């Protein structure tokens, strides 16, 4: 079995050099791959394994020299597979790619930071290898900017970093498989301890193989397209994985860094430097599976998970808190609590003596935590309870008060060190996670609210709120919000949709405010949308109404946004309701779908500038909420510079960002990855408040305005004006298959009969990610740079000045370059040849030329000859993934030709050893061609991760 | 029970059916599920107080000061309207809270329990219409 000698060779040819001296990535991937291939052989035979390995080697040769002969060879092998073998090959390559991502996480997580590799400017902040840690950022603020430590500490206490978890656009991988990935990562890591004993190393190898096989032998389909509650349970995995333990660890490190510049205090235990919000179960925009009851369910589930974790943690806290000397106040509380009926620690003590007052108070808190979980579970499972609300924690102050009493008391007695142990970690967890871990945002289209108001105004014979001009809408909305009469009752003709909207508001009213974040209006355009939501909130008896957040998606919505926000602040009722705080949401991907990526990036910079102008004019604290697709939505290092790049004063101590589902594993799956994530968010926020990026030279603005015009013209002329483009998009791309299959819970279009305008941005991105073409990300850049270069020979120099000195531009280009690295036009060509009509082939050809031209231009702009010349670590990891992804592409393409064309008979090969073909019985397509397709989609999706 | 009675009569057991069974049916019919049906009774002035607190809370004037014809006209426009009248955001005296809460209790109990709402010191159609409106707007 000298088979290993082959994969090593291929791997080392894929990543030739070393990206450092602790570069063990090729080693890691070889080890994992060898163990996996042996498992494949032991379960499905020597022939199956030899086939799979020949496929991998061919793919690696392709990602090396990009000879199309290699694609012809891969295809030749893959078409001759009957559905059984096709499923096993696709599954095989999905799992192999997963293992590659695992070795990547280990390598990243243990790479030694090179203090000599820092250049000294902001470019260092674009990679984890040279970015500033917390303390380095403190020293940067103090030295270069001559800020006093007191100013840094004060800035930090009032800072909030709000991470919003959203559902994954495809396979939000099951919590079980995450657990397995963890065990594999740990086995890998421990195998490379430079001090390990032979028997230890043996048992670790056997454990690694054992877990690789375990993960391979779990189905990844069947059952249901998981219900929204299931998707939410899966999203909450990272709290148990890393985040719960990770928050107090990060905060304590902040304490140390503050000590290391002379600050004697710690960050206050109730200060919300970290917050977590969730859309899982709250975003109903174009997702009818998300019902009112779904929202009630995920709210209660969250309250359960939080109470559970607090329950388990408070027992170790009770064991720690064995002191006797205490404050007079706490002694009073102990004697008071000692007057009662001790069920949840009979294994520990028959009862708790008054000589352990801390243990008394804490034991009572433990009792209240148990009753909160039991009552939430009864509310979820029935609808009523019998657990009195007076015996649980209903708001966060009830919970914090006894703990703060213990802390104060301990400090009174000079036991501050004891107080700063498990107790401090507990207080910080209560403050960060509250009673729910996450706060659920609600999201709905503006049109649904307009429908509701129109049904009401029709029911009152006042006219159609829909037909009303925006000024008439505003005037009516204002008179009603200021009025004393309720608006509607049960006697109201409600369509199924209008009933959905109102019932959602009623659910919101019947749940604790600690559970909710923001109500977000998709497709916001005018103040009447926000006012409409505010009115529906009031007239549905939502006692503590949510903050309303407009999501300005389209380009015209962005230009009109600051006018709208000004008009909203200028209204007396709204101005007093917001209490000096406004949060606006921007969607990088939505605006991209509208008007191309370059024009949307620049328009979003300008729109944030104007919104901060309005917020200062009227004295409101503006908070920008960054939706998916952004520069700040990337994974790892790049996030640091992306945040630093935001226009001055757009953050101001409140960062709200979407943690994309395709990135959450790379950012929170591992202990170090999580810590460094929280760190770069906190450090980037803190620094940007005090050290904004340079303001752009006026010529830079004028240039970007012109480029945006040309770029929008090209993007729209292709996507929207070319009549046959929609024909091409349906052939060269599996967009239709994505809409039909059990990959995401959402419909891909808002109106089934519409063109690209009615297509949601996620299937738009996804469709072109699968073919490694990435049109939605780069289309429009080519003609823009081409235009400015021809318009004046010297504009190229200006662009290069921007990339080297203007952060926003550098990060935008950098993102484009990263996406091009995940691109391969040759594969897009394979899809054309197999799936697209002949008279449409030149169309694709022209598109690919644009692809190529743009790439060259981006390179010229970035001053690079190769893609990602400045980040060889990422270039390496990407190349390693690409070798697996390419096979999944070819398999996807031929599987598509096989599905769409039953008149494409192929010379099948004999089946390859023991089955997986009988796990999808009720399939209308072939015995396992639907499953093969789903596998390649989940796989390519996992390999390409994030683009735009 | 009517099924038992019908069935017995079908089999020529009408005499048996006209015994304890007939007595039972008659007791069900006479006493219903409650034995008695409770009438509610309240002064007209208490209803006038409630309406006046509402009209004051809507800045339309004092329902009390209104002539009987103006009272009637407003009551009519409201009873025929599609918009509810008041909410929790309403300054309720202890008495007005008593009246509204009584209507809420009536709404949350089976109709078999109630007879008639009786207005002591009735004088004009606006008293009856007032009670009808409070009944509707208290669901
Ligand atoms: Cl005992």
From Swiss-Prot, chain B:
Protein origin, superkingdom: Eukaryota
Transmembrane residues, as ranges? none
What are the inducing conditions? Upon inorganic phosphate (Pi) deprivation.
Tissue specificity as recorded in UniProt: Expressed in all plant organs, with higher levels in roots.
**Modification(s) after translation:** Enhanced activity by phosphorylation at pH 7.3 by lowering Km and sensitivity to inhibition by L-malate and L-aspartate, while enhancing activation by glucose 6-phosphate.
**Location of this chain's protein in the cell:** Cytoplasm
The protein's job, in short, is: Through the carboxylation of phosphoenolpyruvate (PEP) it forms oxaloacetate, a four-carbon dicarboxylic acid source for the tricarboxylic acid cycle. Contributes probably to the adaptation to inorganic phosphate (Pi) deprivation.
Q: How does it assemble?
A: Homotetramer.
Family note: Belongs to the PEPCase type 1 family.
Protein name (record): Phosphoenolpyruvate carboxylase 1
What part of the entire protein does this chain span? 412 to 550 of 967
